[PDB]
């Protein structure tokens, strides 16, 4: 009851710290947090980790030209379920064309699941979020904290 609430805030803090580190260095990232709708089919596409959640591990996963970086990290429950997992690309023509594959993958998974997905752009270092087919582009740290707090702490 209260143990899961402490885990969710640790999940939020882990996302904030890792995205800040990667944004400063323009390291692309794609982190999808599953919810009610299971993402088990997409977890199976990646390399399984089943690891404890930490900002340190999230950073090490997305280091460029490493075995674990090319794809999405999926967080299920209180674990980093998989890395290098593949997410469906959205077919939306409304998505801006200056955004890349990570943004299109984050939008695609938000259209068929209720998951919260976070993106770090390797071109601009901007942090974006997707939920329910919508895109919050280049959010600030306050905006990111408010969205994650509302959507991840039940």
* Annotated binding-site residue? 122: yes
Residue 22 token pair:
């990667």
**CB 104 within 8 Å of CB 81:** no
- By CB under 6 A, tell whether 74 contacts ligand 47U: no
In 3D space, the residue among 121, 128, 110 whose CA is nearest the CA of residue 42 turns out to be: 110
Query: Which CB atom, from 88 or from 126, has the smaller least distance to ligand 47U?
Result: 88
- By CB under 6 A, tell whether 92 contacts ligand 47U: no
State the minimum distance, in angstroms, from the CB of residue 2 to ligand 47U. 34
121 binding partner (options ligand 47U, Cl ion, none; Cβ < 5 to 8 Å by kind): Cl ion
* Annotated binding-site residue? 151: no
Pairing of strands 116-120, 29-33: antiparallel
- By CB under 6 A, tell whether 30 contacts ligand 47U: yes
Pairing of strands 47-51, 79-85: antiparallel
Q: What's the rounded Cα separation, in Å, for the pair 19 and 140? A: 11
- By CB under 6 A, tell whether 89 contacts ligand 47U: yes
Query: Which CB atom, from 8 or from 117, has the smaller least distance to Cl ion?
Result: 117
Query: Which CB atom, from 15 or from 72, has the smaller least distance to ligand 47U?
Result: 72
Question: What are the strands of the beta sheet with 134-136, ordered from one edge?
Answer: 47-51, 79-85, 72-76, 29-33, 116-120, 127-131, 134-136
State the minimum distance, in angstroms, from the CB of residue 146 to ligand 47U. 26
Binding-site residue positions:
70, 87, 100-103, 121-123
Binding-site residue positions for ATP:
70, 87, 100-103, 121-123
């Amino acid at each position: 009851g209260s143990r899961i609430e402490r885990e969710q805030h640790h999940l939020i803090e882990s996302i904030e710290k890792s995205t800040q580190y990667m944004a400063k260095r323009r390291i692309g990232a794609l982190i999808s947090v599953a919810r009610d709708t299971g993402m088990d089919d997409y977890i199976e596409t990646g390399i399984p980790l089943n690891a404890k959640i930490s900002s340190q591990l999230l950073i090490n996963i997305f280091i460029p030209n490493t075995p674990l970086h090319d794809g999405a990290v999926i967080i299920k429950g209180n674990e980093i379920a998989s890395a290098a997992s593949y997410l469906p690309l959205s077919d939306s023509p409304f998505l801006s064309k200056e955004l890349g594959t990570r943004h299109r993958a984050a939008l695609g998974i938000s259209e068929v699941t209720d998951s919260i997905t976070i993106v770090v752009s390797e071109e601009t270092g901007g942090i974006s979020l997707t939920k329910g087919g919508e895109l919050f582009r280049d959010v600030s740290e306050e905006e990111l904290h408010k969205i994650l707090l509302k959507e991840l702490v039940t």
